[PDB]
Symmetry: none
Subunit: 218 residues, 2 copies
């Protein structure tokens, strides 16, 4: 349903917007080296949220495939999550984003808005389900004519019995450790399949998780 | 026929409203961010003032999102309701204690108010979900204070009948038009035209209904209002 999806999907961009506005208010507005770049991101997130409301309201049409540089696009996503982490209430370096991208530029046909939603949910999960903190490792590679993204955490894991169930709508693992609706990964799977790709997960209950996304390369 | 239709119409309206209400702050943000990007950011007389407004608009949307999410969770049957036997007197008194304590600090207070308590003497043990019900009392108490005249008295009652536990919360503010006594519990209904979503009482009505109870309001314009909560007793 519309309300539930739009509400769920606005949360990461609102957090990201809040985070950059906070950095600006805290003094970055005085720094000519960074203020314009920060303002540019808030302008982009605000416009993205406005498109998102409309898109999701209309579905109750466009899957807009563009040839995109995944390297840059993934990098832009992770830049926001670093900003969320720095303006976080946690101690500095309580969470780390380590990037492991191949050096060649990878061009892939995607819907930029919808796929950002996918990366947002997985990064946000990777953080939300590491309460004790940790490194989030983000990999970008091409092999066997697939472009593959994997996102690993050192968080709470996922029971083996539930590895399949986690992409189902409303499914939330019911053990100790919060969350919300159980929609993020179902929305994500829907987008990834729509784009001709695949998503899957490996996990160890005490160690952490790795989510994988595969997209057709050429 | 009409039954399914009324439902579908309410849903269609609610969706339309959600889209308009999320859109309006974002549109306001866009306008302040664009002024900032066009150069106001270099200007110390306005950049801080402008940033502050974007921060407030952003907070309002995050509250709206959280509120819309609870409404969804309940609409889904997904919402966890944990009925436990608790002392309503001590729970209500603690709620009022948080509000008295707010006033105890010189802000300066914008407005002074008094919280008058009239509780029954016997202890009322009743099964409820404390986390959710405290939220309900908060929403009514915040309204009661917000719409009180300077120096107004907020009167809080806990009384039981043979069949019911009744809580009432009265203010001496401008009250509510008779045409609207029902509508104030509607999603996004605000009689007025700053922050405030118009979802609080909609959440409250839904929560009180999950708990097996009833909530309603009496008001005489210019007199003030009295909100009631009824809970099944024993
Ligand atoms: N990175 C992760 N580590 C451990 N558990 C995770 C995880 N990412 C997702 N999960 C689990 O999968 C369930 C469903 O995820 P999701 O669709 O994104 O739900 P959500 N967080 O939007 O409420 C979550 O409730 C959580 O139990
Ligand atoms: N105690 C009260 N006195 C006068 N009007 C009241 C009132 N409590 C609620 N109302 C009216 O009902 C409307 C909706 O209440 P509510 O759902 O709590 O709004 P809110 N606080 O989330 O923005 C308010 O805007 C107000 O017009």
């Amino acid at each position: 349903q519309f309300v539930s999806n739009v509400s769920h999907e606005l949360r990461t961009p609102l957090t990201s917007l809040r985070s950059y506005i906070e950095a600006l208010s805290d003094g970055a507005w005085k720094d000519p080296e960074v203020a314009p770049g920060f303002l540019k991101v808030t302008q982009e997130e605000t416009d993205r949220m406005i498109r998102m409301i409309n898109e999701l309201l209309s579905l109750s049409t466009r899957v807009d495939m563009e040839l995109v540089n995944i390297n840059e696009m993934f990098n832009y996503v992770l830049d926001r999550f670093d900003m969320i982490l720095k303006k976080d209430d946690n101690p500095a370096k309580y969470y780390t984003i380590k990037r492991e991208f191949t050096k060649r530029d990878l061009w892939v046909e995607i819907d930029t808005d919808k796929f950002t939603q996918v990366l947002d949910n997985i990064m946000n999960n990777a953080i939300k389900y590491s309460p004790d903190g940790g490194v989030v490792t983000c990999r970008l590679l091409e092999t066997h004519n697939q472009v593959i993204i994997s996102i690993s955490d050192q968080g709470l894991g996922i029971p083996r019995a539930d590895l399949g169930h986690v992409f189902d709508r409303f499914f939330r693992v019911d053990k100790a450790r919060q969350g919300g609706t159980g929609l993020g990964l179902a929305i994500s799977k829907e987008v990834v399949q729509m784009l001709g790709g695949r998503i899957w997960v490996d996990s160890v209950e005490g160690k952490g998780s790795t989510f994988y996304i595969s997209l057709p390369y050429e």
